[PDB]
Amino acid sequence: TQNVLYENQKLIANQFNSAIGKIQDSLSSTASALGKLQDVVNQNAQALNTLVKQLSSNFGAISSVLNDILSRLDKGDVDLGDISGINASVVNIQKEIDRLNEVAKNLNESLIDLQENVLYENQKLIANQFNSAIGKIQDSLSSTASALGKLQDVVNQNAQALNTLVKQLSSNFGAISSVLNDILSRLDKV
Amino acid sequence: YENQKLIANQFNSAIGKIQDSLSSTASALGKLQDVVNQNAQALNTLVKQLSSNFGAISSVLNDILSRLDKVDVDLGDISGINASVVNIQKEIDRLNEVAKNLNESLIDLTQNVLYENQKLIANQFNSAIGKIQDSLSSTASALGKLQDVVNQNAQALNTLVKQLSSNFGAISSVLNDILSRLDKV
């Protein structure tokens, strides 16, 4: 009956509007988190590239001093592998962040403001199109999560390699410092 | 009513699909925050450890230079280099409440005005669904590209570490041969 037909429209409208407002907040939150990740990723890329450049300069400085010692002892040439080829890439997802913020705003226009057969067949078609697109989107999110687990392993491997480097340095250079200490007590300063 | 039923179901079906996409989005964002911050802490550890070793190598070179002659050293300070960390927990949490809270928005139950109202309801739902699907597509695009680069910089970090291991091996090896030559005279 007539009132039930309008009152329903009010429920469909009130519920739908509630979902839009919530979805808008989620879209803004996704845009905010994406922008923050973009920033720290690119900052960290620049920290690494600054590190590599300064290490090259420092290794050359060690290389020069060693040869001077060697030629002094003589009275050879040493090279250390260049690490200049190591480069950290930057990421650019600004276009996606913009679309998210744009649709977040666009949804204001999709809210239902009610006035106080063919359509059904057309409606069957639109949902199918959405179901096909939302499926491809969900598949992309799944494979990305799989890449994120594969990534966790890789970050663990260089956590291992980093600790291995640390102890190799403490062992080699601590031992040199002790051995040199005994040679220095035996020899006279120039 | 038949159209009223059809839209009410289609909505409910799509809300659930959105919910799952929101939950995977918070999940990928949570994983990214962790490996980004781990990779950041590794970089800062490497900087700190290298600075200490460059200082140790610096004193060792000058000490050797003070006992040989006639044929000064401070290495550049890299301790200022810092990798910042990220905090997006508030955004990830909000993504999770909204995905759960979408349960509340689910539904169950002249003649030109109602016909015009249903025409409006269908068109707004269709336009919003199309807009949301496009934004989720953008979210997926950004997450894959984010994974992509953080992986490349993790691999670059790994190759840097293994190159560093050889360079400091070569330095150490040369220093030990210099020590034995000095020991002899």
Question: What CA–CA distance (Å, rounded) separates A155 from A158?
Answer: 6
Mutate to test the interface with A, among B44, B143, B151, B184 (most CBs of A within 10 A): B143
Experimental approach = X-ray
Of A5, A23, A48, the CB nearest to B18: A23
What is the number of other CB atoms lying within 10 angstroms of the CB of residue B72?
8
Question: What CA–CA distance (Å, rounded) separates B29 from B91?
Answer: 9
Give residue B161's Cα distance to chain centre: 20
Contact A169 B53 (CB under 8 A): yes
Question: What CA–CA distance (Å, rounded) separates A171 from A185?
Answer: 22
**Token pair belonging to B68:** 């040989």
Instruction: Determine the distance in angstroms separating the CA of B176 from the nearest CA of chain A, rounded to an integer.
Output: 7
Question: What CA–CA distance (Å, rounded) separates B60 from A163?
Answer: 23
Q: Residue B163 gets which letter from DSSP?
A: H
Instruction: Determine the distance in angstroms separating the CA of A120 from the nearest CA of chain B, rounded to an integer.
Output: 6
Resolution in Å equals 2.4
Question: What CA–CA distance (Å, rounded) separates B168 from B50?
Answer: 10
CA distances from B183 to B55, B67, B70 (A): 23, 12, 19
**Token pair belonging to A125:** 């078609």
Question: Over the Cα atoms of chain B, what is R_g?
Answer: 31
**Token pair belonging to A17:** 């509007």
Could you give the 3-state DSSP secondary structure of residue B140? helix
Mutate to test the interface with B, among A7, A10, A30, A167 (most CBs of B within 10 A): A30
Q: Name the closest residue on chain A to residue B23, using Cα atoms.
A: A141
Question: What CA–CA distance (Å, rounded) separates A158 from A40?
Answer: 20
Choose among B88, B18, B19: nearest CA to A134: B18
Contact A36 B87 (CB under 8 A): yes
Instruction: Determine the distance in angstroms separating the CA of B29 from the nearest CA of chain A, rounded to an integer.
Output: 8
Q: Residue B1 gets which letter from DSSP?
A: -
**Token pair belonging to B79:** 């301790």
Choose among A139, A126, A115, A11: nearest CA to B131: A126
Instruction: Determine the distance in angstroms separating the CA of A114 from the nearest CA of chain B, rounded to an integer.
Output: 6
**Long-range contacts for B125-130 (Cβ within 8 Å, ≥24 apart)?**
B125/A16, B125/A110, B125/B7, B125/B10, B125/B11, B126/A123, B126/A126, B127/A109, B127/A110, B128/A16, B128/A20, B128/A107, B128/A110, B129/A126, B129/A130, B129/B14, B130/A130
Instruction: Name the architecture of domain B2-184.
Output: Up-down Bundle (1.20)
CA distances from A163 to A153, A158, B88, B166 (A): 16, 8, 28, 15
Question: What CA–CA distance (Å, rounded) separates A50 from B86?
Answer: 20
Question: What CA–CA distance (Å, rounded) separates A20 from B105?
Answer: 9
Question: What CA–CA distance (Å, rounded) separates A189 from B54?
Answer: 23
Question: What CA–CA distance (Å, rounded) separates A183 from A55?
Answer: 29
Task: Assess contact for A38 and B146: CB atoms under 8 A.
Answer: yes
**Token pair belonging to B173:** 């090896």
Question: What CA–CA distance (Å, rounded) separates B88 from A33?
Answer: 6
Give residue A5's Cα distance to chain centre: 51
Please report the DSSP string for B96-118 in residue order.
Answer: HHHHHHTTTT-----HHHHHHHH
Mutate to test the interface with A, among B5, B27, B167 (most CBs of A within 10 A): B167
The domain limits of chain B are 2-184
Which residues in chain A have Cβ-Cβ distances shorter than 8 Å to B5? none
**Token pair belonging to A95:** 């276009």
Which residues in chain B have Cβ-Cβ distances shorter than 8 Å to A16? 11, 105, 121, 124-125, 128
Of A40, A110, A158, the CB nearest to B158: A158
Question: What CA–CA distance (Å, rounded) separates A163 from B161?
Answer: 10
Question: What CA–CA distance (Å, rounded) separates B151 from A60?
Answer: 29
Mutate to test the interface with A, among B124, B177, B179 (most CBs of A within 10 A): B124
Of A29, A123, A127, the CB nearest to B94: A29
Task: Assess contact for A97 and B100: CB atoms under 8 A.
Answer: no
Please report the DSSP string for chain A in residue order.
Answer: -HHHHHHHHHHHHHHHHHHHHHHHHHHHHHHHHHHHHHHHHHHHHHHHHHHHHHHHHHHHHHHHHHHHHHHHHH---------TT--------HHHHHHHHHHHHHGGGGS------HHHHHHHHHHHHHHHHHHHHHHHHHHHHHHHHHHHHHHHHHHHHHHHHHHHHHHHHHHHHHHHHHHHHHS---
Choose among B86, B82, B79, B85: nearest CA to B43: B82
Which residues in chain B have Cβ-Cβ distances shorter than 8 Å to A8? 1, 4, 109
Question: Over the Cα atoms of chain A, what is R_g?
Answer: 32
Phi, psi of A112 (to 5 degrees): -95, 125
Q: Residue B34 gets which letter from DSSP?
A: H
Task: Assess contact for A22 and B98: CB atoms under 8 A.
Answer: yes
**Token pair belonging to B6:** 């059809």
Contact A15 B99 (CB under 8 A): no
Choose among B112, B96, B11: nearest CA to A11: B11
Question: What CA–CA distance (Å, rounded) separates A129 from B10?
Answer: 12
The CATH code of domain A1-116 reads 1.20.5.300
Helix, strand, coil percent values for chain B (each to nearest 5)? 80, 0, 20
Contact A190 B92 (CB under 8 A): no
What is the number of other CB atoms lying within 10 angstroms of the CB of residue B93?
13
Q: Name the closest residue on chain A to residue B172, using Cα atoms.
A: A172
- Tokens 């949490």 correspond to what residue? B93
Task: Assess contact for B182 and B67: CB atoms under 8 A.
Answer: yes
